[PDB]
Enzyme design. Sequence first.
Site, PDB file in Angstrom:
ATOM      1  N   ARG A 161      63.616  13.367  89.496  1.00 22.71           N
ATOM      2  CA  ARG A 161      63.250  14.690  88.963  1.00 22.71           C
ATOM      3  C   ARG A 161      64.327  15.265  88.042  1.00 22.71           C
ATOM      4  NH1 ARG A 161      62.335  16.145  94.486  1.00 22.71           N
ATOM      5  NH2 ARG A 161      60.179  15.714  95.098  1.00 22.71           N
TER       6      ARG A 161
HETATM    7  N1  LIG Z   1      55.049  18.917  80.566  1.00 28.05           N
HETATM    8  C1  LIG Z   1      56.207  18.261  80.834  1.00 28.05           C
HETATM    9  N2  LIG Z   1      57.046  18.008  79.850  1.00 28.05           N
HETATM   10  C2  LIG Z   1      58.208  17.388  80.040  1.00 28.05           C
HETATM   11  N3  LIG Z   1      58.607  16.964  81.232  1.00 28.05           N
HETATM   12  C3  LIG Z   1      57.849  17.151  82.321  1.00 28.05           C
HETATM   13  C4  LIG Z   1      56.548  17.823  82.187  1.00 28.05           C
HETATM   14  N4  LIG Z   1      55.995  17.869  83.402  1.00 28.05           N
HETATM   15  C5  LIG Z   1      56.881  17.252  84.236  1.00 28.05           C
HETATM   16  N5  LIG Z   1      57.945  16.826  83.602  1.00 28.05           N
HETATM   17  C6  LIG Z   1      59.104  16.105  84.208  1.00 28.05           C
HETATM   18  O1  LIG Z   1      58.827  15.797  85.556  1.00 28.05           O
HETATM   19  C7  LIG Z   1      60.060  15.768  86.261  1.00 28.05           C
HETATM   20  C8  LIG Z   1      59.959  16.635  87.504  1.00 28.05           C
HETATM   21  O2  LIG Z   1      59.404  17.887  87.138  1.00 28.05           O
HETATM   22  P1  LIG Z   1      59.081  18.925  88.301  1.00 28.05           P
HETATM   23  O3  LIG Z   1      58.307  20.067  87.717  1.00 28.05           O
HETATM   24  O4  LIG Z   1      60.325  19.205  89.093  1.00 28.05           O
HETATM   25  O5  LIG Z   1      57.984  18.073  89.089  1.00 28.05           O
HETATM   26  P2  LIG Z   1      57.641  18.477  90.593  1.00 28.05           P
HETATM   27  O6  LIG Z   1      57.937  19.936  90.771  1.00 28.05           O
HETATM   28  O7  LIG Z   1      56.215  18.053  90.638  1.00 28.05           O
HETATM   29  O8  LIG Z   1      58.496  17.599  91.450  1.00 28.05           O
HETATM   30  C9  LIG Z   1      61.110  16.257  85.293  1.00 28.05           C
HETATM   31  O9  LIG Z   1      61.733  15.133  84.679  1.00 28.05           O
HETATM   32  C10 LIG Z   1      60.332  16.950  84.197  1.00 28.05           C
HETATM   33  O10 LIG Z   1      60.992  16.704  82.954  1.00 28.05           O
HETATM   34 MG   LIG Z   2      57.913  19.007  92.802  1.00 26.74          MG
END
Ligand SMILES: Nc1ncnc2c1ncn2[C@@H]1O[C@H](COP(=O)(O)OP(=O)(O)O)[C@@H](O)[C@H]1O
Ligand SMILES: [Mg+2]
Lengths: 173, 512, 85, 86, 52, 52, 460, 460
Positions: free
Chosen positions: B375
Amino acid sequence: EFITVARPYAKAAFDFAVEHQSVERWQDMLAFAAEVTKNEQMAELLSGALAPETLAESFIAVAGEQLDENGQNLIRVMAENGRLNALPDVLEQFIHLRAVSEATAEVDVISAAALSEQQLAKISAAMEKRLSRKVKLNAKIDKSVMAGVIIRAGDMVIDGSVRGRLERLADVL
Amino acid sequence: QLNSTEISELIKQRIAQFNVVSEAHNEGTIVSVSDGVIRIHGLADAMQGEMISLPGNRYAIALNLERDSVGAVVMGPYADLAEGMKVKATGRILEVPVGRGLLGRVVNTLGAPIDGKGPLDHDGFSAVEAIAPGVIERQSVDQPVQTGYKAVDSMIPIGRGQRELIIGDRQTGKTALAIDAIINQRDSGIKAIYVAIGQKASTISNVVRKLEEHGALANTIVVVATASESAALQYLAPYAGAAMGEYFRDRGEDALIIYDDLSKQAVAYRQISLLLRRPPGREAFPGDVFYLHSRLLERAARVNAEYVEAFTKGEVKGKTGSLTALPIIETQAGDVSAFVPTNVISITDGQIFLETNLFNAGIRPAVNPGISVSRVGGAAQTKIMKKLSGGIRTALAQYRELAAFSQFASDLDDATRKQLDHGQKVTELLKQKQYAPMSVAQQSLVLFAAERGYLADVELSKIGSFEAALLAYVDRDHAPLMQEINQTGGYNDEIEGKLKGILDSFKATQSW
Amino acid sequence: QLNSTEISELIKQRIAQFNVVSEAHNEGTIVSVSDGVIRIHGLADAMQGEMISLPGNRYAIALNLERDSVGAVVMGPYADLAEGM
Amino acid sequence: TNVISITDGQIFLETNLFNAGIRPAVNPGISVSRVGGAAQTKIMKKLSGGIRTALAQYRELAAFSQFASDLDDATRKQLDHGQKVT
Amino acid sequence: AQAEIEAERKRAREELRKQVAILAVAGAEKIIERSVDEAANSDIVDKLVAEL
Amino acid sequence: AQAEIEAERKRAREELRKQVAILAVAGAEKIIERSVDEAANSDIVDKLVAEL
Amino acid sequence: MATGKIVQVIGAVVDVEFPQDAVPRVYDALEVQNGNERLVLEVQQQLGGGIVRTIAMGSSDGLRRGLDVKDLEHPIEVPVGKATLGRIMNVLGEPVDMKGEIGEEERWAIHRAAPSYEELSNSQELLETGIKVIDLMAPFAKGGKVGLFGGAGVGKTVNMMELIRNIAIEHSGYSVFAGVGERTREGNDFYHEMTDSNVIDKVSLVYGQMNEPPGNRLRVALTGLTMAEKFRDEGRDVLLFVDNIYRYTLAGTEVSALLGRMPSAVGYQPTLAEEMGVLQERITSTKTGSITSVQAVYVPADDLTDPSPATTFAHLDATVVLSRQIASLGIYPAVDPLDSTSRQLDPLVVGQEHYDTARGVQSILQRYQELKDIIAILGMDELSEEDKLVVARARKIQRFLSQPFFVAEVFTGSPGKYVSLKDTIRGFKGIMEGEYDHLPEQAFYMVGSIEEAVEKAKKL
Amino acid sequence: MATGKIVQVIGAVVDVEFPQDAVPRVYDALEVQNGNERLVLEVQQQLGGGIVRTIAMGSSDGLRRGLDVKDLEHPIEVPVGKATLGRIMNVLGEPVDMKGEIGEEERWAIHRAAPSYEELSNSQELLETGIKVIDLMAPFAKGGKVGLFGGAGVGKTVNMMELIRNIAIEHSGYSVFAGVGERTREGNDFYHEMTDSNVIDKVSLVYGQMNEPPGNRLRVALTGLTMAEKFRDEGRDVLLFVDNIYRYTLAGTEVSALLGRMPSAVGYQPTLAEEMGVLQERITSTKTGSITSVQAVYVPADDLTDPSPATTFAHLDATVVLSRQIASLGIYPAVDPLDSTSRQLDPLVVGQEHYDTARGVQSILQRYQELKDIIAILGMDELSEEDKLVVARARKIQRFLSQPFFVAEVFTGSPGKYVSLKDTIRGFKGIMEGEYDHLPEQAFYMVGSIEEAVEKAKKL
Ligand SMILES: Nc1ncnc2c1ncn2[C@@H]1O[C@H](COP(=O)(O)OP(=O)(O)O)[C@@H](O)[C@H]1O
Ligand SMILES: [Mg+2]
Ligand SMILES: Nc1ncnc2c1ncn2[C@@H]1O[C@H](COP(=O)(O)OP(=O)(O)OP(=O)(O)O)[C@@H](O)[C@H]1O
Ligand SMILES: Nc1ncnc2c1ncn2[C@@H]1O[C@H](COP(=O)(O)OP(=O)(O)O)[C@@H](O)[C@H]1O
Ligand SMILES: [Mg+2]
Ligand SMILES: [Mg+2]
């Protein structure tokens, strides 16, 4: 062990003995009720699976030195809860509660030798600065603490022994 | 050895310093001894977590302040204690040696040296149990920590201050992966900490021997709780490791800490809980085990320069400290729905799933790219790698969607056969030998090679010799470009042209 | 070793006189509250499945009639009940 | 399994065979005698040889040799004898 | 070097026998918080050589 | 190899100080055993009661 | 002497009450006269109040409440040294053959610390075993630990008897066999085989077999270790065979509840991993002398993820995993090559050719596993023309991993074979490279080197 | 003055004894000095005789027995109103952002009854999110709840960050964010994202961090919810974000096990459906105002059936499921068009135009799924002319559902876009009607609005 189950009966008995200014009588009533529990035969009967109040009655029968209301009622409630074997500890907690309420404490003095008396005067008077209570010394002698003295009050201790110095130094080295 | 003069003078300095006056202390008595737990009756002023001091230089951690007892766990061989012994309550919490001198020492969880190469030259002491930096103190992680595995640094980046879980069944390379991560950091200025919970001592000696055969041991602290040591020491050891790593973090340096088998810390803690008679939860683990790992792992952090300046009282300026954690977990039969795997999968920032099938088929390291995540992701890579690995992600995703047909492949259509062979070639590319880490230049070059179709014609069984020849060729013939990439990680159309030239020249001029 | 809802004040009452026939068999006092369940001491004539009337015009259903106390469930917000009502 | 771990062998009687009229349904291949031939009369030991591995082989051979067969004369006599034995 | 240090180790063993008496008297004097010109030095020397 | 020699020096220049320290405290204890005096003991009492 | 009384008896555990000041220490050994008998108790816990809670090293039946127990002031101690050699001994170190007293000079307490991390030693020197699969897939080193993990009735005892035959007759130093909680018949057969070979005077035997009550099966392994630990400290090197380590943890589980400990993961005692570690950590080599050990590890209900095997795996260097699904095919030894493994299988150690052959064999057998579902459903005809070759080679490799054993002539008549390593990596390299790819499967079943297979093909 | 004394301390659980006139009620808060630092305890049960069992809202180490406990005659109670906006607070309503004291006008207790069935008002005013896939496929109305379902790494948190940015910049609606079991790294990332995006002055943040005791992690949801109730009572429409429901149920399981309640189906606390109801039922659109909510829900191991996600489904109105497979193909935001659903998706409320556009997209994708496995075996050329046209439109729709976020702008760099619902419907209808069959597929990816697709197609 029964420390944790004696506490409620001890507190209740003490509260009652305070409200009736009869502490000193209860203390020996309870001492007697305790020593009846230690009898070879009674201890067997105390373990037998008899109904509460029949056991209570067989117990009361062995006591004439119990004030005919309040001691009986204590015994009968303890019988209802099957806790008669706890008396030896209800006694100790009653004694401790008495100490705490009268603001009087005991302190042990363990020494290489008998002290010089005025020494005991300074020891008690300063322990009454350390503790607020009226302090009662009971000195003892042990040659293991080859010099100086140990003051042991409750579970707070002051180690002035030469032996304590010797080993407390040894573990630096 | 006529230093005996010095010896005796040193003892004389210890004699001179003994402040022989007394201090009042609170006292109790042992009333039970069993399986490492003692019940102490008294100690009205004991505190939870306090170090109680037994006869001999031994201690116990008071964990239950019951109404009329104290349950304490002995930190050491308990068989010698006896009912009726007297016990003292110090005011102290568990503190451990810490500092720069530890690097290259092996210590047990009290920080006593166990390598036998003399005492420590530590920089003072630190509390074992501490609270992590708050929300305001952090800084977002944007620096790479290089593992040297094509398979990991491309698809599953790890950043300074991240917490990446290595999880997999027994005997699949979890320790090898973490120790290669340590070895790679020999030059990188990151100070490593390897803390082994419940391993057999001969394995610890073996890994230390491999770290000494490489250069890495001079860099790193090893903290040991062998499987024969009591549960209290096993359970505490990860905190003693983190407290050693925070000395570096709180002073602007970078550190890396590797808790080997949190799945054995959890077991030691279960034993301690069941002997204290605490109500058991699922699989008999006590309920707070989530709090147990949560507080431990949350201490892995990157702290902004202002918190450093505040902590070091102005001595270090403009530098951000960082502590990176790589806990390891072991799952029975691939089952990730157990109590401890599911807790630590919830706490950490990513996962490296090691698969026993991939490990048997020859794919080593066995990282499963389709369920491994990170992440912090793209944020933590060098931008050359960030650029190049996106296409590996997509190549493998299409391969994983098509793979079902491999057992009917001959029936397929060439328009998909192209993809279904490119997947196999890139997968055969991510295999790697142990103890052979790659600089970022080499991984970037080797990924560029596969991304731009150069491998489209090399035969599957030769990919590894192709790769080896390429890395040798570039190392002699084009070294300044490798120097540039390794030193900056940048990317440009200029760099892309140079790489295309290198591949063209190699593919004609050399052979494999 | 567990105490069984016998406590300092109640034992002092039993000290005062043992057979507390004085007490009505119709009334009692709450001695514990937790998770929406309460334990009542007294109520010698409670009958299993009965409706017990709490203060604030609410009800509890007596489900456990035990040797010393009645365990009941509360039919509404319980959080403001207190030991000794 | 607890008891398989205490005894000196086992005679495993299989229900598939028993339904096919093969009675007793001694499944060779699982059943074994950990004291082996040391217990047998010399004539029985001589005549039996390693027969039980012969029937184990015949019974697993029948696992592939129903829908098709290969080396189809030596397997044919192997199957013939195994069938007349059972 | 291991045989060389073993020679050095016994020469130190010789030298330390004297210093340990001086440490014992310094310890006793700090422990009791007073000097003592002790009389029965026979007990000191008896320990001094016998264990070393 | 040189680091292993310097380790063996530190190790045998710790265990030797252990041997002296043990004999030092055993000797100080024997000195206290004979030096003990009721006046000095009473001064120990006076110092512990003043520190108390 | 006396100064105890019994106050409870639950199964194997007995509570004894002493005057407050005399209470024995943990692991001290008490004694009781169980009628016209003598019974030894080992104290496990000190409860409060002068009580102590113990395990009976003998038949608990016949104990009244109120007997008098004598407090021996020392732990259990066993004969040790040359005198022990070639004799059978109880858990208490009594002689159990019919011969005279053990003339030992010295006795050691069976509870001891493990050697310091400072003291351990590491050695790469390979140990050759006659067994193709074991030293192809899972070679092991002099001074390492080997473990045979298996179900019930798959071959973990016969395999250990072949390892004894191959290593122990061809090794100069002394040896120790600790029988823990397994058949008495097998221990008697082993004793008479040793004595009729005249090798018995090298080997010391300890036996706390299935019949004995839990205290014996609990503490016997510690005796066997104490004897091996003596021979090690003398600076010898030693072979230690443990007959079944699982019975030690099982005897711990039987007693666990009676000692008043809350149960754990699958009923096991809470202290499983410590109880196992404190034993396993003292069976090691050291800079003064070295122990080579083979431990048989039973896995209950064939479940390789039960807590007891799962915690045993981390202790051992070379793990050999037998499996019932291979043995039911008659392929003895039933070693599963996709779960066996060794700390020693490194190019650095075994050399490139051996490592590469082992990994090639694993790759083929895994590729064969990945096909068994499609083969099971759709039949062998739907495979690609190159997969039919993978299958045809895997089904040969499986057989060529079979070997006849000298100790197994009893079962199958066929005479045993000894196969040298050099002679087996060649055979497997051959089969993999497809140069014996014109030979029927049954040509490979139960043969020695590849040349006995090429011969067996001629005769069908 | 302080009137009670601590009598037990077992991990996070603390027991306090009071004189029987003064016994605190349930959920009353107590205060004690843990040395130089204040600690507060929340009463969970009344037991025995003036004894009270409590959970510590802070690290339990350092507590002695016999410390003096002063009881507050309040439950826990927190600052509310505008004063909170742009502050970060813990569960107790203390600042953790170092900007000093909050400047509260009023304090409200965190435990309060849900609205009566009488007070609710059913209003179907759709939210406009600016996110193409969500607004089209899974519309939700004021007062409703949305569950973002997915494994780890799929984009729940960044989807919530984007949703906050859009609602706060385009529609100016106050938002409360309650981080139940927040990862501090992710909480600091969020704080700096909201302060850079300049939205922060219209959001109030509450964090119960993972490293905190279970009592903190459980109650934080009620603090955030009480702040949302104050803004609702001011007649605003607020939007409440909860960062995991899963961690709320885990904190409830930990607190239950610590209190020693007997566990249930998979260890979950007896009270699971009550705790979920007590939280979920206060989030409703009373006549005076509205709380809308969006809630992240991790699904452990992709089962969708263990009690925490299975029990939460009963309360949600729309469910958006994110898949890691789609995300790996790079179509962020990684909603999966076919699995996501909403109760508000029926003609009567969304209008026939919208309903038909949505069902059209579903039909086109569902047929493309059929076609993919013909295309694999036979290649593209055997399809009919309309099958190739359906495939081309289905791919162009699948691409067009992607979108760049103003908060992902740091990961990609590319500047975010906001797409209004009119433009979403007009775009998907125009694609399905073939008005854009002349643009290449890449022209649709990440553009944002449909006119931007038409523009982007020129330069490619
Ligand atoms: N629309 C997006 N654009 C760029 N990166 C994203 C996008 N959606 C998710 N990511 C990537 O997914 C990874 C984890 O994001 P996060 O929101 O913390 O996911 P979650 O909360 O589902 O674990 C990060 O590397 C983030 O850059
Ligand atoms: Mg998450
Ligand atoms: N990249 C690799 N290539 C080849 N072999 C490897 C590689 N990585 C690990 N191995 C081998 O796998 C074996 C198991 O390694 P390792 O002990 O690191 O796994 P593990 O998960 O630590 O096992 P355990 O869980 O028992 O500690 C080692 O012998 C090692 O040689
Ligand atoms: N090499 C072999 N050849 C033939 N049979 C074997 C061989 N190895 C093991 N077996 C069979 O394995 C069976 C199980 O015996 P054993 O190994 O004692 O099981 P356990 O491992 O439970 O002790 C024996 O009856 C023996 O016939
Ligand atoms: Mg490992
Ligand atoms: Mg067996």
